[PDB]
Ligand binder design. Structure first.
Ligand SMILES: C[C@@H](Nc1nc2c(cnn2C2CCCC2)c(=O)[nH]1)C(=O)N1CC2(COC2)C1
Ligand SMILES: C[C@@H](Nc1nc2c(cnn2C2CCCC2)c(=O)[nH]1)C(=O)N1CC2(COC2)C1
Ligand SMILES: [Mg+2]
Ligand SMILES: [Mg+2]
Ligand SMILES: [Zn+2]
Ligand SMILES: [Zn+2]
Lengths: 320, 318
């Protein structure tokens, strides 16, 4: 079970995600589906929603980063943003359901090695998906294989028109999380920012893509306390790949290269050039984003630059 | 240089102002700790030996701004503090207490005022002698046992060879553990063993002894503001000697030693936040009493130098 202080904390991006066992996390997710009115408006069976949440959990691998606690971080951050940006005045319940279900499903069965590995290694997945966002395409297929199982089918009581619309929105959102598309998806968005229209379908579809993109990579929005161990987990996984890429002679990405990668320099760039501009142009629609998220991103960038100068000092002392 | 009973009491706390005393009384303070800890008693250390050795050690520290005899008094005195604060007499044997104590006193003998990077890049005799491997700490540890090689400084003379081998080994691990080049390696080994620490486990206890000597080594900002701040000045002074000379010779200059780059604020903020605090954080998990006595001054000094840095940046608006 869960406290009423927990249930309140669950709505802000300061929620401490490392406090909870999987069981308590499935209840937090379940609760979001009730509290957002999704159960009510789409006639979701309350036991089918529990089943489905457990159905999702099992299909998540035990990876250092891309695991079931990661998708909880993303789902819980999406939830946080519904309240902080009043999205229930700007979006239909269907769009909310798509945003929260895609956020829960967008890394199903991640294997721990990114698209570049998949392709360069000519994996089954790269071969099945023709080098085209193989992981993200795999994530959707799993999410809908899960929903094709009737007792995991939280959509059982939605009419087929509604299903098709939800399934199409989920596919877009999950496929939009492929970071190779970041500059493209960002450019389309800001272009529409010169005159953003809530009644333009393309515009809403682009705002949702950015919204799930924001949640996916929002660990440094959380308090330094919560954010910091995530970078550790990320580098683990990343070194796990680059080690493989060399027992294999495959190219090695500099940001996974043990010889060139510190915790400071893994974040300093990523905050400055990816996380801040993204939340900036998002703040242009929700000013109250500036205080609650764009702020921890400035203090995070500033801490990690300090850490880099200490790290470098220490790197004089070895390398002889 | 007879110690007053007031001084005996202040000597056991990290608040001890290390600046009042001259080499005479520091020597006396060091002497009291060997008696007070049971080391004179339990290793049959001749008391007159223990006086010559201390002056034997005192001669072999140079007059550097920072790495000098007063620095070695602080490091031994903070160790002494920690034996009482964390009650390490309950956790460690009197040989371990002997290793920790003697290694603190000797850990920087004959320091020249130029770190390992200078020794290596200038290709000095120390670096050539030690094959670029921790040439200072290798040399500190070697002077120590050259001093104990003399019969009139061998405060170990009544220890059976089985014992001497036992102490010499541990002393060497500790002194060479204070090479800051190895900070992350040693801390990481410690955080590993700490996930399920074991006082019965020799490897778990050698890392803990290494953390302790490393803790006391850089413990200056655990002292009160009035005691610590002048150490920051001696530090930049020694460093500024190194980087000035590096410049005259066409040697690389470490940015954190650069006269035209470093402020007292930037010397201390990252060091406290990313080396001192995290290190004492992991010790506090075996010895929670440390949070109150040593984290407490470390958080205060953090914030203090942080506001000092904002003041500096704002004033850099001329
Ligand atoms: C710079 C480095 N840092 C980095 N990657 C992250 C974070 C969160 N998710 N991801 C990955 C992004 C999604 C998977 C985890 C984070 O806080 N930092 C990195 O991996 N970047 C992102 C790319 C990879 O393609 C751009 C270079
Ligand atoms: C600028 C300097 N500040 C700094 N270094 C210290 C202290 C005490 N000993 N040391 C060094 C410890 C070894 C001797 C002096 C202190 O209070 N501040 C710093 O942050 N660094 C990074 C290193 C660690 O190795 C490079 C020195
Ligand atoms: Mg993904
Ligand atoms: Mg030293
Ligand atoms: Zn993700
Ligand atoms: Zn020292």
């Amino acid at each position: 079970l869960l406290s009423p202080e927990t249930i309140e904390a669950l709505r802000k991006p300061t929620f401490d995600v490392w406090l909870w066992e999987p069981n308590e996390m499935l209840s937090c997710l379940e609760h979001m589906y009730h509290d957002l009115g999704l159960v009510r408006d789409f006639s979701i069976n309350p036991v089918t929603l529990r089943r489905w949440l457990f159905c999702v959990h099992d299909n998540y691998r035990n990876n250092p980063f891309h695991n079931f606690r990661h998708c909880f971080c993303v789902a819980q951050m999406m939830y946080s943003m519904v309240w902080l940006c009043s999205l229930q005045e700007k979006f239909s319940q269907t769009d909310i359901l798509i945003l929260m279900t895609a956020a829960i499903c967008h890394d199903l069965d991640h294997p721990g090695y990114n698209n570049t590995y998949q392709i360069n290694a000519r994996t089954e997945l790269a071969v099945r998906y023709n080098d085209i966002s193989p992981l993200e395409n795999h994530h959707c297929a799993v999410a809908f294989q899960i929903l094709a199982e009737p007792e995991c089918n939280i959509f059982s009581n939605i009419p087929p028109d509604g299903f098709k619309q939800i399934r199409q929105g989920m596919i877009t959102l999950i496929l939009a999380t492929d970071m190779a598309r970041h500059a493209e998806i960002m450019d389309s968005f800001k272009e529409k920012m010169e005159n953003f229209d809530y009644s333009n379908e393309e515009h809403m579809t682009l705002l949702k893509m950015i919204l799930i993109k924001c949640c996916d990579i929002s660990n440094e929005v959380r308090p330094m306390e919560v954010a910091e161990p995530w970078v550790d987990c990320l580098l683990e996984e990343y070194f796990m790949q680059s080690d493989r890429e060399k027992s294999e002679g495959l190219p090695v990405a500099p940001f996974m290269d043990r010889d060139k990668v510190t915790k400071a320099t893994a974040q300093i760039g990523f905050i400055k050039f990816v996380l801040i501009p993204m939340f900036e142009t998002v703040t242009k629609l929700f000013p109250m984003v500036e205080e609650i998220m764009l702020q921890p991103l400035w203090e995070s960038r500033d801490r990690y630059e300090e850490l880099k100068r200490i790290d470098d000092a220490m790197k004089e002392l070895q390398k002889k």
